[PDB]
Design a protein around this ligand. Structure first.
Ligand code: HSM
Length: 175
């Protein structure tokens, strides 16, 4: 049993997890939308989630990721560092998932449903003590690519979509 988009022959070309993780090294990726409200790490009604990486390890297909985020329990931006490794899920031959490992050893395995050069549509299976759902991440929180947005809306049908990282997360300019 697995999502119908988890068809490697059909969709694998757009589900390259290692390529997507390395992309976090060049540009910050912002989670612009999601279909769920709570994350065990980011908190409740979490918003303003972004990530940047460094320390690419080709032998391990892992990076060190630095996250920023907000939730309804603190008015200040929060930060955390986690290791993320490209792994295989749903019988795939080429890595199509992200295995996050927090400093306390907690593990989350999410799956790339669709990914293009500057955006990712990620599926949260809901088996890591968390809510099942989808996330949309992109490098520019103000200009969302239509291809990823359409794929996110397509796969996330029947749920309640909400904004996560938007310009409201920052107070931009001066004076
Ligand atoms: N679906 C996001 C799970 C996660 C990873 N790190 C923190 N939370």
């Amino acid at each position: 049993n697995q999502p119908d988009w988890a068809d490697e022959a059909a969709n694998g070309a757009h589900q390259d997890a290692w390529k997507s993780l390395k992309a976090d090294v060049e540009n910050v990726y912002y989670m612009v939308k999601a279909t769920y409200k709570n994350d065990p790490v980011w908190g409740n009604d979490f918003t303003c989630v972004g990530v940047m990486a460094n320390d690419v390890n080709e032998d391990e297909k892992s990076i060190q990721a630095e996250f920023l985020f907000m939730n309804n329990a603190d008015t200040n931006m929060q930060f955390a560092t986690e290791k993320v490794t490209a792994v295989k899920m749903y019988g795939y031959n080429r890595e199509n998932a992200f295995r996050y490992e927090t400093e306390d050893g907690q593990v989350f395995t999410d799956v790339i449903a669709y990914s293009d050069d500057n955006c990712d549509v990620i599926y949260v299976p809901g088996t890591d003590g968390n809510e099942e759902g989808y996330e949309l991440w992109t490098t520019d929180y103000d200009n969302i690519p239509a291809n990823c947005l359409n794929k996110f809306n397509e796969y996330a049908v029947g749920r309640e979509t909400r904004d996560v990282f938007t310009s409201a997360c920052l107070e931009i300019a001066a004076a």
